[PDB]
């Protein structure tokens, strides 16, 4: 694959350019929030982000080398994780708040009306506070997000050599992460510590996603808010 021939800087530049735009929500400041309306905003936003995620995924090195079935599986597994880490990333400079959208900056109190939102909110805030404490860089962020895409569903015949291909690309992103930290001037020991620190956060992002699915499907089973058929199919993938 051509992806394996990419240098560290080529890997970084490719991921940076593949970055999806920051979308706006359909927030209406003329009316107060309800559980339905707030869920309406979040799910509408997520749906529009999904379209951009799919294109971003195609531009992640090694992803298009996979079969369509494998690409589907990886996105079905990681889509909420990817949405969350992006949310956490752009909320970094907003202590105590989550920037879902430039016109949707919320604190933990504003979504108390939504089922299970406060629980996930606190976990998201904690993740955001961690990235800020670690002074997470943009180049590190795009590496972590690509890792989530390739890793989250990798452990779920002939194409076992494509599982090999995924791991080789994951190894490339690992080299890239180290290369970034070395370029940042971190000592050799600080590099393998920070690498461990960043990757351990993925365990918590996975945790938040699974808890998120649990609440989303619950509200879906209560008809709280009409979901797009795409979003319905993403949810059913985890069920």
């Amino acid at each position: 694959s051509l992806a394996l021939s990419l240098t560290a800087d080529q890997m970084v530049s490719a991921l940076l350019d593949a970055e999806p735009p920051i979308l706006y929500s359909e927030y209406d400041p003329t009316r107060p929030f309800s559980e339905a309306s707030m869920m309406g905003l979040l799910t509408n936003l997520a749906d529009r982000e999904l379209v951009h995620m799919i294109n971003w995924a195609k531009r992640v090195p090694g992803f298009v080398d996979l079969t369509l079935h494998d690409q589907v599986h990886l996105l079905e597994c990681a889509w909420l994780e990817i949405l969350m880490i992006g949310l956490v990333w752009r909320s970094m400079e907003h202590p105590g708040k989550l920037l879902f959208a430039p016109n949707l900056l919320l604190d933990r109190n504003q979504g108390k009306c939504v089922e299970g939102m406060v629980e996930i909110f606190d976990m998201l805030l904690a993740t955001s506070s961690r990235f800020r404490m670690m002074n997470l860089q943009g180049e590190e962020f795009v590496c972590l997000k690509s890792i989530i895409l390739l890793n989250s569903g990798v452990y779920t015949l002939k194409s076992l050599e494509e599982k090999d291909h995924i791991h080789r690309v994951l190894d490339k992103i690992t080299d890239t992460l180290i290369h970034l930290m070395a370029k940042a001037g971190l000592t050799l020991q600080q590099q393998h510590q920070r690498l461990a620190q960043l990757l351990l956060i993925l365990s918590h992002i996975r945790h938040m996603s699974n808890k998120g699915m649990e609440h989303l499907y619950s509200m879906k089973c209560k008809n709280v808010v009409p979901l797009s058929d795409l979003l319905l199919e993403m949810l059913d993938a985890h069920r």
Binding site: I54, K58, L68, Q71, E76, L230, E233, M234
Partner: peptide
């Protein structure tokens, strides 16, 4: 097919 499986081509 899945909408996701459709969008990964278009």
């Amino acid at each position: 097919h899945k909408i996701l499986h459709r969008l990964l081509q278009d």
